[PDB]
């Protein structure tokens, strides 16, 4: 803890070429563990631990939950387009929901939706009502509140979501609690007369990390540029920070990498 | 676990 469970849903009129129009993927503590799409018509494990700690019930049920959501989302695409007076084109429904369990026993939840990449509607903090982000979502607010949708999502988020998240974290404790050391490389090709120094951490886990440039031993932040944290294909991450120097001042710069996996912070020069 | 959406 903190521990998180997150589901994100995409429903699109224009995927497109050999791509599924409907997808749902689940993440525990920010890592992919579950996948469903309209081509497969099947939920599948994406980590060894989820597969090893569930029975066939789990997959057959989730699969049919996925197939059900597929029909509901087909209609919702239709409904939102009509609200927006659309008769064609690329459009998308997005759902994003889940729960957090904070180290302190306190939980959190959120249920929010977008249309064409913009806020459409969401359950509000007290989980008693929905707040439409656009006028087109107003009839939806009215309908759901008449149908006691908020209460139904209060239960899912505060009980169902949390209880299952407890099971998941327990299943994949070892995997989620592991550490993987980044290999770091510093490099500086140039031209146009500027020495561009780059420092890259490869395959670190968990996610959090610090990669900084030092100039005369002093951290040169204001002007280093980061690509942020981007994922590898194996549940590890990558980051890449650059800085331009004089061609010759190269020897004055050092990249420093701090990570939980490291015996000591890495400190590396160019060349 | 995943859960079912309501109808818009």
């Amino acid at each position: 803890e903190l521990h998180t469970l997150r589901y994100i849903r995409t429903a699109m009129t224009d995927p497109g070429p050999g791509q599924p129009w409907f997808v749902t993927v689940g993440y525990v503590d920010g890592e992919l563990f579950v996948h469903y799409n309209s081509t497969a018509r099947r939920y599948v494990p994406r980590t060894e631990w989820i597969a090893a700690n569930t029975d066939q019930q789990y997959w057959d049920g989730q699969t049919q939950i996925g197939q059900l959501n597929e029909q509901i989302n087909r209609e919702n695409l239709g409904i939102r387009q009509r609200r927006y007076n659309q008769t064609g084109g690329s459009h998308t429904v997005q759902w994003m929901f889940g729960c957090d369990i904070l180290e302190d026993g306190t939980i959190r939840g959120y249920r929010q939706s977008a249309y064409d990449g913009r806020d459409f509607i969401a359950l509000d903090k007290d989980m008693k009502t929905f707040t439409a982000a656009v006028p087109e979502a107003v009839p939806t607010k009215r309908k759901w509140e008449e149908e006691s949708e908020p209460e139904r999502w209060k239960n899912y988020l505060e009980e169902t979501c949390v209880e299952w998240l407890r099971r998941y974290v327990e299943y994949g404790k070892a995997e989620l609690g592991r550490r993987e050391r980044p290999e770091v490389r510093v490099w500086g090709k140039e031209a146009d007369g500027i020495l561009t120094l780059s420092c890259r951490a490869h395959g670190f886990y968990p996610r959090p990390i610090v990669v900084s440039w030092l100039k005369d031993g002093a951290v040169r932040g204001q002007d280093a540029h980061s690509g942020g944290i981007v994922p590898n294909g194996d549940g590890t991450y990558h980051t890449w920070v650059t800085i331009e120097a004089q061609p010759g001042d190269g020897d004055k710069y050092q990249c420093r990498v701090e990570h939980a996996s490291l015996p000591q912070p890495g400190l590396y020069s160019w060349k | 676990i995943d859960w079912f959406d309501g109808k818009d």
């Binding site: 993927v25 998308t92 981007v230 | -």
Partner: protein, 97 residues
């Protein structure tokens, strides 16, 4: 700005004659439809995985393509991206370093 923000990077720091994985990560875009091709010398490579996709809290989509490979001496690797928010395909060259 809803154009794809692309980075090309290898799983491991690259080495002469060493097996690796080439990654292309596109982020911050909409609509989700996108074309992302890993390329060796202006031609597609072999065996490309696409996930997930997913999106951020701001609802912008992201997509990762990765493929097993060994960097060949004298070869140029790059990620070719096509998305409707751009006039023409974008080509992001990989730096072997």
């Amino acid at each position: 700005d809803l154009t794809p923000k692309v980075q090309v990077y290898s799983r491991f720091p690259a080495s002469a004659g060493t097996k690796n994985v080439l990654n292309c990560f596109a982020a911050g875009f909409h609509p989700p439809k996108i074309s992302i091709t890993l390329m060796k010398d202006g031609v597609p490579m072999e065996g490309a995985q696409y996930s997930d996709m997913s999106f951020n809290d701001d609802w912008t989509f992201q997509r990762l393509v990765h493929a097993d490979f060994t960097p060949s001496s004298g070869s140029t690797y790059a990620c070719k991206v096509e998305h409707e928010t751009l006039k023409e395909p974008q080509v992001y060259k990989w730096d072997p370093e």
